[PDB]
Design a protein around this ligand. Sequence first.
Ligand code: BDX
Length: 390
Amino acid sequence: GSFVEMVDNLRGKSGQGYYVEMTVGSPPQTLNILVDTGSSNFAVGAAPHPFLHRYYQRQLSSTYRDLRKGVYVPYTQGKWEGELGTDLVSIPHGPNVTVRANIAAITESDKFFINGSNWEGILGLAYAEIARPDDSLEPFFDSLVKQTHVPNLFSLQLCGAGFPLNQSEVLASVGGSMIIGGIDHSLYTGSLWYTPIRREWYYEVIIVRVEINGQDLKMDCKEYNYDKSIVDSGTTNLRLPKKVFEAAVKSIKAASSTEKFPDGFWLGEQLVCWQAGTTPWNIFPVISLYLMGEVTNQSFRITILPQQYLRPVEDVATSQDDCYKFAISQSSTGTVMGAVIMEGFYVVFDRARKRIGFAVSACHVHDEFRTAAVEGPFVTLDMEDCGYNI
Ligand SMILES: CN1C(=N)N[C@](CCC2CCCCC2)(CC2CCCCC2)C1=O
């Protein structure tokens, strides 16, 4: 592991997000920032909010520059509005550099800030094409690379604990690593396998085959990428296109049929609980997603366990039972490989080579009988037809 200064620099959990410490302004103002590979704006709370105990104070920064421009960003579950400007930004447990970056000072929001998440802003790590108001607002990572010698690459190890973390525990626990400018080999086991970034906007990829316990879901592969497939640390669940979700849940129900679960469980709304330590992991199937490889007609697969797709939640009774929510849900906007999937892998966002790498995570939760996996190669034909075109 050659990047010790950045190892273990993340905190958080799949449901409320993983964050990294950053500083903004002169003198430096410390803020916890959500790592979001599914957006492209660096936006931080800049005004009092019930869920914030600190925020960016522009008037206290001598290096603050006002862009005299507003920004409005509505999203599925909510929205954030702010004022654009630039200032000096650093990552304490990151590369030893300071860069001038765009910052959206959030002045109004709805369903953005999460009570108790311990973060005050978000770091959009995707491409300028999806930056708001438009692609002229240079994303933080683009600025970082343009202004320093930092390699155009970052890697994420998100570490799920495998059990509920109370408020005190989640603040004291290491939630993972964000390695800026490199790959730290202590964070994964086995080999790294790369899939092409199809297009530079979201981190878009192409899924070419899906298996539930080795059983082919057997759908036209274009269904798996309708209308796109992305890797998004800012989404909790593995989200699947409606038709794929329907087929996958049918297959997961069949594999786990020795136990009947309520409709609310499958809808990802209600938790299911087992006596302490008795979670029947073995009745649940592993899920394999085959991804396009970098070699013509070659693919590889990533396999996750129910320890990834069943998300640990505290029982409404704080009892001693082990409880979970089903973290696979439907989407009308394509496949989203969210945090619960990323928790099984060390994921390399190799922007320089326009590819995303996957390897088994040194911190993935498993049992004595099964482990997550990244395996290849497999001969796979016509993978280009798996990509969706509007
Ligand atoms: C899922 N998702 C995401 N990964 N980022 C956003 C915005 C997505 C962008 C995508 C491009 C267009 C503008 C919105 C924000 C949320 C992230 C978690 C914390 C609450 C807000 C979102 O809705």
